[PDB]
């Protein structure tokens, strides 16, 4: 489940940028 900024706004292109808006693969970032 993606946070409140990943819904229509997933900004993580990879787990590297994922450490910026989240800490793990929400339901949209990488696997
Ligand atoms: Cd997220
Ligand atoms: Cd993320
Ligand atoms: Cd995401």
UniProtKB/Swiss-Prot annotation:
A single MF term (Gene Ontology): metal ion binding
Segments of this protein annotated with the region Alpha: 2-31
Residues holding a divalent metal cation 4: 3, 6, 22, 26
Translocase among keywords: no
Domain of life: Eukaryota
Chain ranges passing through the membrane: none
Positions that bind a divalent metal cation 6: 12, 18, 22, 29
Signal sequence annotation: none
Record: residues binding a divalent metal cation 5: 6, 10, 28-29
Entry similarity comment: Belongs to the metallothionein superfamily. Type 3 family.
Function: Binds six divalent metal ions. Known to bind copper and cadmium.
Name of the protein this chain belongs to: Metallothionein-1B
Native species: Callinectes sapidus
